[PDB]
Design an enzyme around this catalytic site. Structure first.
Site, mmCIF file in Angstrom:
data_model
loop_
_atom_site.group_PDB
_atom_site.id
_atom_site.type_symbol
_atom_site.label_atom_id
_atom_site.label_comp_id
_atom_site.label_asym_id
_atom_site.label_seq_id
_atom_site.Cartn_x
_atom_site.Cartn_y
_atom_site.Cartn_z
ATOM 1 N N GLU A 1 -14.726 -33.459 50.457
ATOM 2 C CA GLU A 1 -14.650 -34.825 49.895
ATOM 3 C C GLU A 1 -15.421 -35.780 50.773
ATOM 4 O O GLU A 1 -15.454 -35.588 51.985
ATOM 5 C CB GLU A 1 -13.189 -35.325 49.781
ATOM 6 C CG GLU A 1 -12.201 -34.436 49.041
ATOM 7 C CD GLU A 1 -12.518 -34.019 47.615
ATOM 8 O OE1 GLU A 1 -12.017 -32.947 47.205
ATOM 9 O OE2 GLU A 1 -13.221 -34.772 46.899
ATOM 10 N N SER B 1 7.070 7.309 1.187
ATOM 11 C CA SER B 1 8.136 8.303 1.016
ATOM 12 C C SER B 1 9.142 8.413 2.162
ATOM 13 O O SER B 1 10.234 8.904 1.939
ATOM 14 C CB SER B 1 7.548 9.662 0.668
ATOM 15 O OG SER B 1 6.939 9.573 -0.604
HETATM 16 C C1 AZR Z 1 5.242 9.395 -0.370
HETATM 17 O O1 AZR Z 1 4.826 9.006 0.714
HETATM 18 C C2 AZR Z 1 4.471 9.821 -1.610
HETATM 19 N N1 AZR Z 1 3.564 8.727 -1.856
HETATM 20 C C3 AZR Z 1 3.794 7.737 -2.781
HETATM 21 O O2 AZR Z 1 4.735 7.589 -3.550
HETATM 22 C C4 AZR Z 1 2.702 6.703 -2.748
HETATM 23 N N2 AZR Z 1 1.468 6.998 -3.052
HETATM 24 O O3 AZR Z 1 1.250 8.332 -3.484
HETATM 25 C C5 AZR Z 1 -0.131 8.608 -3.819
HETATM 26 C C6 AZR Z 1 -0.261 9.966 -4.456
HETATM 27 C C7 AZR Z 1 -0.794 7.562 -4.705
HETATM 28 C C8 AZR Z 1 -1.041 8.837 -2.600
HETATM 29 O O4 AZR Z 1 -2.280 8.600 -2.733
HETATM 30 O O5 AZR Z 1 -0.448 9.287 -1.577
HETATM 31 C C9 AZR Z 1 3.004 5.368 -2.274
HETATM 32 C C10 AZR Z 1 4.236 4.968 -1.807
HETATM 33 S S1 AZR Z 1 4.191 3.328 -1.305
HETATM 34 C C11 AZR Z 1 2.535 3.249 -1.736
HETATM 35 N N3 AZR Z 1 1.864 2.092 -1.559
HETATM 36 N N4 AZR Z 1 2.056 4.375 -2.226
HETATM 37 C C12 AZR Z 1 3.677 11.080 -1.323
HETATM 38 C C13 AZR Z 1 2.724 11.474 -2.423
HETATM 39 N N5 AZR Z 1 4.585 12.214 -1.122
HETATM 40 S S2 AZR Z 1 4.642 12.893 0.449
HETATM 41 O O6 AZR Z 1 5.469 14.059 0.195
HETATM 42 O O7 AZR Z 1 3.281 13.191 0.842
HETATM 43 O O8 AZR Z 1 5.284 11.924 1.300
#
Ligand code: AZR
Ligand code: AZR
Lengths: 595, 598
Positions: free
Chosen positions: B41, B348
């Site tokens: 300063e 699921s």
């Molecule tokens: C569970 O996870 C189950 N999936 C669904 O129900 C949903 N989409 O399924 C499809 C086939 C469209 C996909 O492309 O996976 C779902 C639930 S909430 C949402 N936005 N989409 C699947 C198919 N069964 S698991 O056994 O693989 O979990």
């Protein structure tokens, strides 16, 4: 434990609060305050006992912005409340601060704060901590900041601020948190005299320059503040010889002709209009004016806050102790301290320094000096009156401030020998040009530096350092700092280790002091005083630097934006009355004290 | 005294330094350092020798920015030096900070820092504190910051950061300055397993979807960081079967054909190009690639940081203790913790909760449920395979994740009872719609909330709260906090009993459906149950599973929801991570299953 400021007469003048923590027992905390913290974040992974348990470990420590550490300190800093006086909305406001006490701070980001607060209030409702009634009341509640002032400085404001601002400039904000008791060199009586002398002197200049009209018209009276014994009032009725005004307490007052007749209108610095012949020429209804009562409060007068500024700095020439300091008309106007920060040109007020250097080379106050026309490159330094007195004594050349003699002495004594002397006198290397105009008082200086310079004459040729701290004690009572200043005259103390450095021959300082005493006795009932007036180009500055063996005072008058004070406003007219008033009173009842 | 982060195993994994002050005796300060403060300063009114005496009262306290209090703490924080190792220029730099430790700070304003410093150096010269030789040397000296890292978190990064971030989120930066010892619930062995499982799993997904090209081209190598055993390198020369790359230590390496031949180019989420036939098809000169070395070192291979993300969260179902946590591929790649902050749809993985309620109402895993087309006002839920199985057992409907059965069960159970249950295990009220799509797993959830959910099955129907702090000690050794968690089973371990959110028989029957799902629809273990999940257009891949002592939830997906690929399921994608972790975490522990308490 705040930073405490004392004068040299043991008077507590100021208190500076830093980081604040008011610890509270957990059981003393309102349940809604704990709820506000619990609702402040969507998820805790430490309904939810754990966050409540861990909150107790931090509740008195949490940094909540603006020096607040813990809930009680925030309640105090933000609302001047105890945690038990806080509303739901204020509790929600505080609880939103831990995350970022700057982004969500109500002082800095009021919009962002209310956003955070209302979200927490909404979450307190969803969590069942508050009813919908409590919720609607709280969201509708405004910020309601009631921030108490923790920088108490209402006795000698310039003196108090000098301590806080200097510690903060050199050591930062941690300097305040220390809880230290700072014992200054400030003489409270001399400080009170200086404040009154600067106020009176600035008001004397102001009044003779004329009435500049009301400070505001048709503006709310609550937006104005009282200071310097001036009280904002609103004109409610105007008569031929008198007017009625409304005060800040709601009471109506009357100003008689005698309290306003002085109001010749300002036209410019060299002109005032005709004396007023009716109250309507001075004030309009709805005007915001300043009034001043008498001691009894039985009569009021129309006053005016000066636009002009001023300063006073009084130091002890034996050790550099700062005895009194006034940095402007009044501290409410602004914290700006002109004694320490006001860089201005000194004019003729610099001449005793250069002439003392001529006296150093073997000249005497009687030595003939040449006041005739001169040239350097192309530049012709002309005298004020465009007159040349020829061969004249050194002392007469100084008294009449002959610019050609000064330039001639600068050539005799050399620029560098002068620059080193100006630097020895206190002056800043960067602010001193490497040219011949320095003989004129062209370097920008601080009044404190001029005081230091004039002390060389009062003390017999020594360099003293201005200082405001006598001692510092810790909160526990221990002396942690004792001033060990450079003394000009050690036997003089005991009417002490460090002896000041001699910057001028004893005989030159003594000769200059006596020239200065002769100057003050050819331009108070005292014979131990010496001094020099200064005025700059177009009277943009008015100075008086003077002393006795015990006290050096430097006064300055001018506008912050350099503008003429007026054709007639020489240093001897505007700054000199302030100096006289202070010196006469400060030295009243002290024996003659020469060099 | 830093904030110390410890594992349940009493092992120090992180240290968080807060406000630092290293007091020094005045006589130990270099005279030039004092001179730098005197020159800081233009005027002192306390030459100016009085400032020197007053400076001694502040020299160990002065806030100098970046948590530095006093000259020694600044020398350490800024240069990793002692005050006696500082140069004139560095002393001038520190001395310029008291006034404004932000407006002049070298970290934030390096331009303003040097402006202030050089001015102080100039003033030290004018005051005769330094010679012109000392001055010319000092002004020419660059900033030279050598800032040591005071947030040590190089062992289990996501675990260490969980503690620092949480304390700071709730209690602010003062929580670190406290000097407290945090003894966490994290199991270091399980944490090490989790980190490796997430890395491997994400890399397995990544590689099969092909080479996506260098992460940067013609960018400065110094702007990249090594992490996950991948080292940033710059391509300097490309040959027919090999390429040369420049490392961060300046050494040039060679990648042979074997280390890059895997690089089939990514075309789209469901397509990869032809296997590369030359190095020029894989890399360009000036490309910023990632390389990986051997167990010792002999050769380097071209690797790829996955663009796909993932997480793992492992909790104790009896008290909610967080045993392992991995917030993403690598904490150094992304600080963001997906286990605690990653809001995604569970799909699921939500079904076991809804189907559990149907058991509360008196249904059995064998009860016939109707998998036929359904219309809910305007909405018509369709099954994944566009197939309808008709009358099927409740357990088969769950195993095959039949969306029409779920909606039909939601109508039987009622939306609100379901919403209450979701909320009961941690799900957020605001994130749970008041509609029939919740049966399909449309609510946005955090993986930690799903773990809390699945713990209800492992523990026999109780709500536990996830927690990471076991105890907190002060710097002086005193226990200032002891965890008092809600226990599902107190004899199983004041003590706090957890609230029952589901019937013992419902939790037990769902646990055994989940056991069947895992034993017969996919480790040498018979005490495991779990559920896969996949969302619309495979935007998310999940696996939520448990034993009686540990619940693990794994997730895979892109931060910006995009398909993972037609084939990329539950699956397949998140399940291998779960298996790898569980297999290793449970290796050498006896069978642990749920308990029925009718
Ligand atoms: C569970 O996870 C189950 N999936 C669904 O129900 C949903 N989409 O399924 C499809 C086939 C469209 C996909 O492309 O996976 C779902 C639930 S909430 C949402 N936005 N989409 C699947 C198919 N069964 S698991 O056994 O693989 O979990
Ligand atoms: C001293 O203060 C001296 N003033 C000057 O030398 C300066 N200006 O004087 C003139 C007459 C030009 C003026 O316009 O006032 C001056 C010096 S440096 C500066 N910027 N201006 C006066 C004349 N002597 S005093 O004794 O009247 O104060």
């Amino acid at each position: 434990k705040p930073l405490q400021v004392y004068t040299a007469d043991n008077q507590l003048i100021a208190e500076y609060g830093g980081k604040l923590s008011i610890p509270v027992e957990y059981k003393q905390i309102p349940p809604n305050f704990i709820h506000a913290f619990l609702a402040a974040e969507d998820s805790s992974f430490f309904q939810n006992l754990s966050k409540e348990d861990i909150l107790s470990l931090y509740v008195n420590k949490i940094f909540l912005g603006k020096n607040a550490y813990g809930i009680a300190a925030a309640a105090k800093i933000y609302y001047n409340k105890s945690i038990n006086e806080l509303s739901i909305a204020q509790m929600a406001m505080i609880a939103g601060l831990p995350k970022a006490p700057s982004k969500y701070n109500p002082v800095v980001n009021p919009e962002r704060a209310l956003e955070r607060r209302n979200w927490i209030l909404g979450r307190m409702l969803q969590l069942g901590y508050i009813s919908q009634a409590e919720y609607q009341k709280a969201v509708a509640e405004p910020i309601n900041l009631n921030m108490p002032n923790r920088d108490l400085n209402n006795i000698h404001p310039y003196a108090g601020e000098m301590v806080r601002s200097e510690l903060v400039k050199h050591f930062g904000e941690q300097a305040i948190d220390s809880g230290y008791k700072v014992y200054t060199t400030i003489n409270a009586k001399r400080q009170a005299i200086a404040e009154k002398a600067v106020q009176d002197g600035l008001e004397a200049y102001d009044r003779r320059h004329g009435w500049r009209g009301a400070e505001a018209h048709d503006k709310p009276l609550s937006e104005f503040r009282a200071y310097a014994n001036t009280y904002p009032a609103q004109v409610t009725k105007v008569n031929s010889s008198s007017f009625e005004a409304l005060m800040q307490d709601g009471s109506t007052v009357t100003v008689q002709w005698s309290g306003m007749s002085w109001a010749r209108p300002y036209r410019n610095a060299n002109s005032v209009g005709a004396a007023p012949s009716r109250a309507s020429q001075i004030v309009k209804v709805k005007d915001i004016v300043r009034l001043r009562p008498n001691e009894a409060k039985t009569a009021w007068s129309l006053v005016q806050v000066p636009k002009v500024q001023g300063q006073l700095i009084a130091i002890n020439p034996n050790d550099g102790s700062i005895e009194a300091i006034v940095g402007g008309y009044n501290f409410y106007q602004s914290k700006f301290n002109r004694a320490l920060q006001g860089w201005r040109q000194p004019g003729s007020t610099i001449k005793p320094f250069l002439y003392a250097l001529a006296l150093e080379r073997g000249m005497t106050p009687y030595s003939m000096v040449n006041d005739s026309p001169i040239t350097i490159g192309k530049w012709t330094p002309k005298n004020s009156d465009g007159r040349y007195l020829g061969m004249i004594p050194l002392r007469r050349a100084l008294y009449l401030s002959r610019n050609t003699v000064s330039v001639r002495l600068l050539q005799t004594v050399g620029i560098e020998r002068t620059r080193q002397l100006f630097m020895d006198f206190g002056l800043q290397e960067d602010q001193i040009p490497r040219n011949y105009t320095i003989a004129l008082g062209t370097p920008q200086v601080l009044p404190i530096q001029m005081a230091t310079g004039y002390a060389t004459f009062a003390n017999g040729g020594y360099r003293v350092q201005p200082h405001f701290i006598q001692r510092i004690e810790d909160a526990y009572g221990k002396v942690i700092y004792e001033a060990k200043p450079e003394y000009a005259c050690i036997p003089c103390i005991n009417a002490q280790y460090r002896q000041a450095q001699r910057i001028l021959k004893s005989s030159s300082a003594y000769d200059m002091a006596n020239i200065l005493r002769d100057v003050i006795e050819h331009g108070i009932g005292r014979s131990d005083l010496g001094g020099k007036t200064g005025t700059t180009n177009d009277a943009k500055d008015a100075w008086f630097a003077g002393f006795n063996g015990k006290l050096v005072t430097v006064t300055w008058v001018g506008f912050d934006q350099p503008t003429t004070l007026g054709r007639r406003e020489y240093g001897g007219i505007a700054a000199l009355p302030i100096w006289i008033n202070f010196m006469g009173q400060a030295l009243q009842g002290t024996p003659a004290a020469w060099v």
